[PDB]
Design a binder for this molecule. Sequence first.
Ligand SMILES: O=C1N[C@H](c2c(CNCc3ccc4ccn(Cc5ccccc5)c4c3)[nH]c3ccccc23)c2cc(O)ccc21
Ligand SMILES: Nc1nc2c(ncn2[C@@H]2O[C@H](COP(=O)(O)OP(=O)(O)CP(=O)(O)O)[C@@H](O)[C@H]2O)c(=O)[nH]1
Ligand SMILES: [Mg+2]
Length: 166
Amino acid sequence: MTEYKLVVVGADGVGKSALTIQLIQNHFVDEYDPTIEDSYRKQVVIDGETCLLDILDTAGQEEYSAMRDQYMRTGEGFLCVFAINNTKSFEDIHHYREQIKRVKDSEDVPMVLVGNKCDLPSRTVDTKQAQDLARSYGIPFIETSAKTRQGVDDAFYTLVREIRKH
Ligand SMILES: O=C1N[C@H](c2c(CNCc3ccc4ccn(Cc5ccccc5)c4c3)[nH]c3ccccc23)c2cc(O)ccc21
Ligand SMILES: Nc1nc2c(ncn2[C@@H]2O[C@H](COP(=O)(O)OP(=O)(O)CP(=O)(O)O)[C@@H](O)[C@H]2O)c(=O)[nH]1
Ligand SMILES: [Mg+2]
């Protein structure tokens, strides 16, 4: 039995809350309720190990950006979420990744690049663009949908596997 402190980060509206609520409660939140800070818990078996996921759902709003330092210091692994219909959110990954590396004084932080909202009929951020970014960071890239559950379990489980490896 091992606890893993996971942090879900990204721009305001990429679907951080919807991804976490889908993982835990098995349902899609269609509403847009801006987050200040919430934490969720999930006990799952990953590679025969009982994993106690302590998931922090953070604010995309810059209004609460001062809270970032303490949670980045405490967090073991990070899901860096952008939406596939939002180029700006994809560009923001660099700024989130830079802050995490600086605060933790480490370039080798367990991290997973998450391209959310892949259920959408149209896309602005190409799969190859995101694969190339993940390859440049040396981290895994997983396409997800908080609506259909596409890649949601793989995103969180892969992050746990990155923490264990580190
Ligand atoms: O040291 C910290 N731990 C916070 C934390 C959690 C919460 N652990 C589970 C837990 C236990 C005891 C209570 C008592 C009340 N709550 C509700 C609660 C919800 C959200 C935020 C705080 C409290 C609790 C929730 N998971 C993380 C995953 C990655 C990084 C940091 C955390 C946290 C948040 C923060 O911004 C700064 C520093 C820390
Ligand atoms: N079609 C689709 N919509 C999604 C998906 N994930 C989230 N959404 C939608 O996007 C909107 C924002 O989702 P939300 O989870 O609140 O984003 P957030 O990043 O937590 C917003 P904040 O940073 O302010 O907390 C909601 O209307 C939600 O239904 C998805 O995978 N597919
Ligand atoms: Mg939210």
